[PDB]
Amino acid sequence: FDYQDALDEIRETEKFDFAAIALPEDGLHSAVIKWKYASGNINYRYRMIVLRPGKGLAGLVIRTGSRKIVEDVDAELSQNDKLGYPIVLSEALTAMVAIPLWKNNRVYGALLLGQREGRPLPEGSTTFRINQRLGSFTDEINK
**In whole angstroms, what is the distance from residue 117 CA to residue 101 CA?**
27
Going by their DSSP bridges, the two strands 31-39 and 106-116 should be labelled as unpaired
N-terminal to C-terminal alpha carbon distance within the chain: 28
Provide the 10 A C-beta neighbour count for residue 100.
26
- Four-residue CA torsion sign, 134, 41, 17, 95: positive
- Determine the topology of domain 1-143 in CATH: Beta-Lactamase (3.30.450)
Separation of alpha carbons 126 and 122, rounded Å: 9
Give CA separation, 81 vs 55, 65, 75, 114, in Å.
11, 19, 11, 16
Q: Measuring CA to CA, which residue among 105, 133, 107, 106 is closest to residue 19? A: 133
50: left (phi over 0), alpha (psi -120 to 50) or beta: beta
Edge-to-edge strand ranges of the sheet holding 18-26: 31-39, 18-26, 106-116, 93-103, 68-70
Backbone angles phi, psi at 40, to 5 degrees: 80, 20
Structure determination method: X-ray
Chain centroid offset of residue 57 CA: 7
Three-class DSSP labels, 68-137:
EEECCHHHHCCHHHHHHCHHHHHCCEEEEEEEEEEECCEEEEEEEEEEECCCCCCCCCCCCCCCCCCCCC
